[PDB]
A paper describes a structure:
Shiga toxin (Stx), a major virulence factor of enterohemorrhagic Escherichia coli (EHEC), can cause fatal systemic complications. All Stx proteins consist of a catalytic A-subunit and a B-subunit pentamer. The catalytic A-subunit, which is a member of ribosome-inactivating proteins (RIPs), has an RNA N-glycosidase activity that cleaves a specific adenine from 28S ribosomal RNA to inhibit eukaryotic protein synthesis. The B-subunit pentamer functions to bind Galα–Galβ–Glcβ-ceramide (Gb3), a glycolipid present on the surface of target cells.
To elucidate the precise manner by which these shorter peptides bind to Stx2a, X-ray crystallography analysis was performed with co-crystals of each peptide and the Stx2a holotoxin, which were obtained via the soaking method. We were able to determine electron densities for AR4A-mono, R4A-mono, R3A-mono, and R2A-mono, and X-ray crystal structures were solved to final resolutions of 1.80, 1.80, 1.90, and 1.75 Å-resolution, respectively. These structures reveal that the AR4A-mono, R4A-mono, R3A-mono, and R2A-mono peptides bind tightly to the catalytic A-subunit. In all cases, the common Arg8-Arg9-Ala10 motif (numbering reflects residue position in full-length MMβA-mono) interacts equally with the Glu72, Tyr77, Val78, Asp94, Ser112, Tyr114, Thr115, Glu167, Arg170, Thr199, and Gly203 residues present in the catalytic pocket of the A-subunit, whereas the Arg8 and Arg9 residues of the motif electrostatically interact with Glu167 and Asp94, respectively. The amide group of the Ala10, but not its side chain, interacts with the Val78, Ser112 and Arg170 residues. In addition, Arg6 and Arg7 of both AR4A-mono and R4A-mono electrostatically interact, respectively, with Asp94 of the A-subunit and Asp70 of the B-subunit, which is adjacent to the catalytic cavity. Overall, we find that the binding patterns of these shorter peptides are almost identical to that of MMβA-mono. We found that R4-mono, AR4A-mono, R4A-mono, and R3-mono exhibit greater inhibitory effects (relative IC50 values = 0.387, 2.27, 2.70, and 3.68 µM, respectively) than non-tagged MMβA-mono (relative IC50 = 8.14 µM), which was used as a positive control to compete the binding. Although the precise mechanism of the detrimental effect of the C-terminal Ala is remained to be elucidated, the presence of the amide group of the C-terminal Ala may contribute to fix the binding manner of the peptides with this Ala, such as MMbA-mono, AR4A-mono, R4A-mono, R3A-mono, and R2A-mono, to the same orientations which are clearly demonstrated in their crystal structures.
Numbering used by the authors:
A (entry chain B): 1 to 56, 60 to 70
B (entry chain C), C (entry chain F), D (entry chain D), E (entry chain E): 1 to 70
F (entry chain A): 1 to 241, 257 to 297
G (entry chain G): 6 to 10
Amino acid sequence: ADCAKGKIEFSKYNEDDTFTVKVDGKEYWTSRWNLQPLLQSAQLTGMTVTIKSSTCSGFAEVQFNND
Amino acid sequence: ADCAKGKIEFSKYNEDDTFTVKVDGKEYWTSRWNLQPLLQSAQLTGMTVTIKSSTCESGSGFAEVQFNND
Amino acid sequence: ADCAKGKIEFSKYNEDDTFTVKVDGKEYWTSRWNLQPLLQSAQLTGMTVTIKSSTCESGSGFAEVQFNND
Amino acid sequence: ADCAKGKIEFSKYNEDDTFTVKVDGKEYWTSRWNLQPLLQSAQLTGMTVTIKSSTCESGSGFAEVQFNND
Amino acid sequence: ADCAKGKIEFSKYNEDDTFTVKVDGKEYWTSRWNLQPLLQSAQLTGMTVTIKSSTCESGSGFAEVQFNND
Amino acid sequence: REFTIDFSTQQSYVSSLNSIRTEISTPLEHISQGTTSVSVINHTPPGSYFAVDIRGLDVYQARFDHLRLIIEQNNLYVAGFVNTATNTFYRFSDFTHISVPGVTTVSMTTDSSYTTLQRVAALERSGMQISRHSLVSSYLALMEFSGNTMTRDASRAVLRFVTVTAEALRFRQIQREFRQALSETAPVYTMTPGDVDLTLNWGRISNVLPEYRGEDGVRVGRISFNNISAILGTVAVILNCQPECQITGDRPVIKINNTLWESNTAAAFLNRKSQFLYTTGK
Amino acid sequence: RRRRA
């Protein structure tokens, strides 16, 4: 399911080495480290991200689109 | 074969840690970890890439890609 | 607690492979290597960062940080 | 030997995970994992790179590269 | 001690797994791979870097460096 | 078209440069105050050039007056130099498409790249000194020059004259810094690393500034501008975005936190993978 | 291609 679609409103590196993003007013986190630079880049360049997951908590699938 | 040449239309990080790009209307996935940020930077700047694979149908895998200056 | 919020005034790689940032006049260091390039990108782009820690004395460690655009 | 000095005309991620750049009309590959983002950054900004290797024929490998601003 | 302060004039990766930068006319090297993307980004964005070391001999190693936007 | 650059005084020098810019370029709508702007070179067909007559090396004196520069109009490159006493055009090897009627064209083995010129000149541009005195020495070297291959002294002369003509046309910063050397004090202008970086980033700057709409800043690789006065104080003439306009990709800019970034610069520091994985995957 | 003068 497409859990959230939009711009990253903020990102956060967490003490447990996960990474949180807020998208369309909802917070989601991922434990996949390579998503940390990918998400921060999307946030900086204004990409639309689509957080995807079987339960929309944690995610490990996300689509990146230029604005 | 050279399957698709053009700009990355979207990219996607996948739950199996592979990474998908759509080029010339077709989707391709790679398990090469190092390609993830290289492809995303190509995407954000509009770099043309050439996806190279044994099969060129959308949904094919690749392990080889050329970053062009066109 | 929110120890400091603002732009990164400088960053510094340290000989023990920790990484220091100065935010709102206070210095904090992290041993999380993953944060080094992310904090550099934030610094380069004028991101507003929020250092979060249970110890907020300058010179203290941190491993939680929020990144905001304008 | 100084094999090539110029801008990166294209880069390629190879099936064996090495990384190829074309500089001054010749192709050079490197297995050095640290160089992949650095070489793409050079290509993106049109940096002049100096490829040094014991052989300079197109298709030679390298591990030594200088990144210049001019 | 502050060995050198300025923009990075060039950077270079050597066959012997050292990474040289030239700052304010002086060359220094580091084998911390953490510092390669940090230093190259500093170079390509024009940050002012401050190389720091206990001893600031020419051609000596370093693993402490401050990054400033200006 | 023919223009004079008169080195007699700061007034005559800046007046000369301004006149050239007015004729060959058009102000950007969004970077213009009074008649002081960042301008875009007007399109001319490939191979079009203008001539620059060098005057006033000896303040207000009709002497040292046989040097002319041939400048390709679309890119402001110096294609070569004319000795008008011998009616000879010494043309760099990368400008065989530039045809000048009425002169004897000497096609040179030397190309005009700064790399080549600095090598032959045994002179780096960073730290290069230019004074009225060394412009006179440069003039004399160029009028003594003969043959198809640049000598050391002719290359030093071209480095100095290109800096104070074409590079000053491009960069008001270089105009402002160099022009102090023309005063009665006769100080030395020293080309700075910042000056050099500006000249090396001219194409990239040219691709970015047409997109400026009053953002708080502009970032193009190593180049940063923090306000319109910084832009205007630094840049005067840009390419019409020419191959120098594009490195790779097709996105001139990204607006990030009210700063206009060259997209390729941002891409070049946003292409790193996870740091721990990078450093341990040796 | 390197910067031309």
